[PDB]
Amino acid sequence: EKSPQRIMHIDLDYVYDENLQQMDRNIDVLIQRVKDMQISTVYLQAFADPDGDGLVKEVWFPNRLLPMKADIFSRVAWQLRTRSGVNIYAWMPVLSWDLDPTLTRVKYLPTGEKKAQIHPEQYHRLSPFDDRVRAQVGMLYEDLAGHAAFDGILFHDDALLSDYEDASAPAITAYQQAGFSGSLSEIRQNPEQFKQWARFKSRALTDFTLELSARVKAIRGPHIKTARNIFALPVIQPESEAWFAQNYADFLKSYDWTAIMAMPYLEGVAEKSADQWLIQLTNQIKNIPQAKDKSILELQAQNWQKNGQHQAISSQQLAHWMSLLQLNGVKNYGYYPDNFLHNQPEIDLIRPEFSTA
Ligand SMILES: [Cl-]
């Protein structure tokens, strides 16, 4: 991978159509669009997410555990790799799979309540502390690896845990065997243990992704690159690892690419403060030598609204943000999501700040 990295992060939900001939045309237009953009890399959705409900029930590749909505991941991937001139990372959930209900789910401990529960507004994650979960998610990644050729894996941002998670019984067991108390409330009120517990959860998640990476590499070979999405807060306010279980230095040591969700509006930043926020993000990154050379900053191309809808970020604003990143010494970047159906973002408007050529 010769620098700079310039990433289009692409959902296939848009490309899918019940009409095979329409889906044909959609794929052709998408292939041409990526070709015309002239960038280095596509992060390509391997799972279906038609409702954005935080749980994957269907995927775009044949496999042993979940329905295949349409066999299109490999079809799009090989054409992007040969015709559009890009590396492809298979974008996969780490935890949020609609598998066997007897599999342990991540739970949180509600204030004033005895029994752990599933947090309503979080990804519907399986617990990485359940060995059956590790095996089954492993099978999904092996099925992907066996049925499609690609250049990398992008691990989804659903590999996170809050400061009241994971409260499930297998997680509790894991903490106890690691030397912590079985009571989350107790851990949370101990200065040293709370710090250590956050770190433990971060490593647990990272280790799980590395197990999955090894499984993929066993099949496709060791040349496969790894990337993982990290939330902005663990980068800019590292103490936030306490409620994300993500650690930036850990990502930098563990993956080829750390894909930072550099998305001010997602983080509640006022429109007029977005430049300052992006600049401060780049500043924090440069506190770690070579971090920028191992990080991709993913800008948002949509603004996601409270009531479930989203609207486009203007292409001119996206281009300005890209200009800003370059001027602050950040050369590796991209955006999410892409919408070929409406040429959003507008190829002609963003290419001068985006394209490698
Ligand atoms: Cl449980």
UniProtKB/Swiss-Prot annotation:
The keyword Endoplasmic reticulum does not apply. GO terms for cellular component: cell outer membrane. It is an enzyme of class 3 (hydrolase). It is found in: Cell outer membrane. The keyword DNA-binding does not apply. Its EC number is 3.5.1.-. GO terms for biological process: carbohydrate metabolic process; cell adhesion involved in biofilm formation; macromolecule deacylation; single-species biofilm formation. Its main location: membrane. Keywords: Cell outer membrane, Hydrolase, Lipoprotein, Membrane, Palmitate, Signal. Disruption phenotype: Deletion of pgaB does not prevent PGA synthesis but does block its export and biofilm formation. The synthesized PGA is retained in the periplasm and accumulates at the cell poles. It comes from the Bacteria. Disulfide bonds: none annotated. One of its GO terms (molecular function) is hydrolase activity. It is a lipid-anchor. Catalyzes the N-deacetylation of poly-beta-1,6-N-acetyl-D-glucosamine (PGA), a biofilm adhesin polysaccharide. N-deacetylation promotes PGA export through the PgaA porin. Contains a N-terminal polysaccharide deacetylase domain, and a C-terminal domain required for PGA N-deacetylation that may be involved in binding to unmodified poly-beta-1,6-GlcNAc and thereby assists catalysis by the deacetylase domain. Belongs to the polysaccharide deacetylase family. This is Poly-beta-1,6-N-acetyl-D-glucosamine N-deacetylase. It comes from Escherichia coli (strain K12).
